[PDB]
DNA sequence: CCACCCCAA
DNA sequence: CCACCCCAA
DNA sequence: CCACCCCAA
DNA sequence: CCACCCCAA
């Protein structure tokens, strides 16, 4: 064993160009990673309760209580886009392509090491690393998805983005059935609302266990752990953003006038009066045909309510929402169309030369136009008869509940089996590939957090442990916890993600927006003086097509 | 009407009415349940 | 000897 | 001699 | 040598 | 088990 090398190191992105603007994406990312020995080697079940946040009646969305249980195995994640590539090739796939489509998956780890740590207190004291050849490594797959799914993008616990970094798994945890309640309380409502940690539903008891489910196969230094190939089945990604809404739909009015001279202030008028007009409407009232009354086909995305903080069993939660931007990013509400948010530190982007422990963050804005200012709408009386008046139309700027704050706005959700929608595009890096898909008889026509979503079985989890190396000192009738050789061990990691897009022809006349290199991107893209990086975010759909 | 529309088998006492087999097209039904909400989705934060 | 409001899965 | 914004159902 | 919470795509 | 800045003389 012991003698010689199990894998290589490859981290390269292949383009094999097909027939007829099929391209294959085969992106590879051998990492090194490095873990350290589980504190315990027990299972813990563990309450939070920061009731000292919900106290103040006034805070109520910063209600940390969960009941979560701890496990001695250690988990990794590679379900992340800044994992798979670097900001030369995406800008390739976004300005060349224009669907993108997931294929394979197959993740293979080599090179075991395991050394243990020698403390000769002597003088400094000073520390003797030494390698314990005969030691093992816990690997563990969950093939047959029977525990719970915990995506480490969420909370930027992945993997390094940068190739000729070492990087960490993150500890691993899951829920557990925690039942509460909470009510609301602004900063007036007197006295102690109402909070409580229930406990548990003695019905919703789901206590995992990785030894018991899971085999376990046990690594040496001259093993060599490599999963299969995962064929994904699930939808396509479109490189592609629409930009219409419902006044950018159809045949537009025959203008009977044009100007005569140039200028943008010279506007070519229909020449007809709105009360006299030709073509459709879905009302029976008025005889106005304006580009606001016209009979559309259908409607754009939805309006639902925003800062709609629901709750059940759990606790309060928000609701989510799958909208594109509208409105120029100078008039947003990036919470209306829930526009995501994004914090990572030192390993997901951000500059590695940086200190202290404050995130940075970007609030992705898409480029698809399915979103809406809701400070622009209204809802008047059946009866038309504009000019409307005040009692005969309730406005956003008009208070609903005696509140000021609030609105109709605020309460409104206009789904109809009318709506039409687009996926949320990929957010590279940090964001998410593909998330398993939930187990309800009745399923989300889309997720927020992925692009892909798989139909059937998604990869199973890679959980990966230390083995427990022990003294000449144990017994299992104690109270306390053993005593263990402090081991560690670092192991390389490799990835081999395959992607499957086509690629854009022009068809217009004007240029695409496409993704370049500025007087102001330069020095975003390339280390420093002192070998400082980070890996900035950048959007994914940009491209015009066509709604209708 | 009844009697215009589906016909009708006059039994007496030394009759029998049988239907046939009827083949069921319809999804199947979960005798499990989920305790997850919102809250209990995904990856819990890190307890130092 | 039960199939998609008739004869007629 | 009309197929999913090109050649090209 | 990863398929739909077990053996077992 | 080195070929013309990728897969791939």
Redesign the pocket.
């Known amino acids: 064993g012991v003698g010689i090398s199990t894998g290589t190191f490859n981290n ?6 097909l ?3 099929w391209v ?1 994406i ?1 992106a590879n990312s051998s990492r090194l990673v490095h873990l350290n020995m589980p504190e315990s080697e027990n299972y813990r079940r563990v309450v939070v309760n920061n009731m000292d946040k919900t106290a103040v009646n006034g805070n109520m969305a910063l209600d940390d209580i969960h009941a979560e249980i701890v496990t001695p195995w250690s988990l990794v994640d590679a379900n992340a886009w800044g994992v798979w590539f670097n900001p030369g090739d995406w800008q390739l796939i976004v300005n060349t392509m ?1 669907e993108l489509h997931l294929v394979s ?3 293979e780890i080599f090179n075991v090491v395991l050394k243990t740590v020698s403390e000769s207190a002597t003088q400094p004291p000073t520390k003797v690393y030494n390698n314990d050849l005969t030691a093992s490594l816990m690997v563990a ?7 719970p799914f915990t995506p480490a993008a969420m909370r930027s616990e992945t993997l390094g983005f940068y190739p000729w970094k070492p990087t960490i798994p993150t500890p691993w945890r899951y829920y557990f059935q925690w039942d509460r309640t909470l009510i609301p309380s602004h900063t007036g409502t007197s006295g102690t609302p109402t909070n409580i940690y229930h406990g548990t539903d003695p019905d919703d008891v ?1 206590f995992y266990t990785i030894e018991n ?1 899971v085999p376990v196969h046990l690594l040496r230094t001259g093993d060599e752990f ?8 699930c939808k396509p990604c479109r490189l ?1 953003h629409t930009w219409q809404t419902n006044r950018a739909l159809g045949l537009p009015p025959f203008l009977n006038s044009l100007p005569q001279s140039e200028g943008d202030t010279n506007f070519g008028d229909i020449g007809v009066q709105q009360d006299k007009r030709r073509g459709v409407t879905q009302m029976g009232n008025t005889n106005y045909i304006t580009e606001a009354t016209i009979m559309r086909p259908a409607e754009v995305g939805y309006s639902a309510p925003y800062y709609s903080f629901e709750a059940s069993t759990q606790g309060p939660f928000k609701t989510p929402i799958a909208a594109g931007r509208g409105g120029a990013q100078t008039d947003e509400n990036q919470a209306a169309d829930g526009n995501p948010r994004y914090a990572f530190g030192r390993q997901h982007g951000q500059k590695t030369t940086t200190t202290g422990e404050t995130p940075e963050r970007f609030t992705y804005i898409a480029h698809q136009d399915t979103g809406r200012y809701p400070e622009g709408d209204w809802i008047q009386n059946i009866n038309f008869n504009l000019p409307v008046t005040n009692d005969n139309v309730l406005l956003p700027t008009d208070p609903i509940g005696g509140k000021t704050g609030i609105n109709y706005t605020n309460i409104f959700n206009t789904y109809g089996p009318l709506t039409a929608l687009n996926n949320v595009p990929p957010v590279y890096p940090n964001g998410q590939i593909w998330d398993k898909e939930f ?1 309800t008889d009745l399923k989300p026509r889309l997720h927020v957090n992925a692009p892909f979503v798989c ?8 959980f990966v442990k230390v083995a427990p190396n022990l003294t000449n000192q144990y017994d299992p009738d104690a109270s306390a916890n053993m005593s263990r050789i402090v081991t560690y061990s670092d192991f390389w990691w490799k990835g081999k993600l395959v992607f499957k897009a086509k ?3 022009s ?2 006349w004007n240029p695409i927006q496409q993704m370049s290199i500025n007087v102001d991107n330069q020095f975003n893209y390339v280390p420093s003086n002192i070998g400082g990086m980070k890996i900035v975010y950048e959007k994914s759909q940009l ?4 709604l209708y």
């Open positions: 390269q992105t292949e383009f094999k160009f027939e007829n603007g294959y085969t224009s998956f197959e993740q797959l969950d093939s047959n998805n029977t525990m789901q489910s490599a999963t299969g190939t995962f064929f994904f089945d592609t187990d139909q059937n079985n998604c990869p199973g989890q890679l690629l854009r022809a068809h217009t491209a015009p097509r066509k």
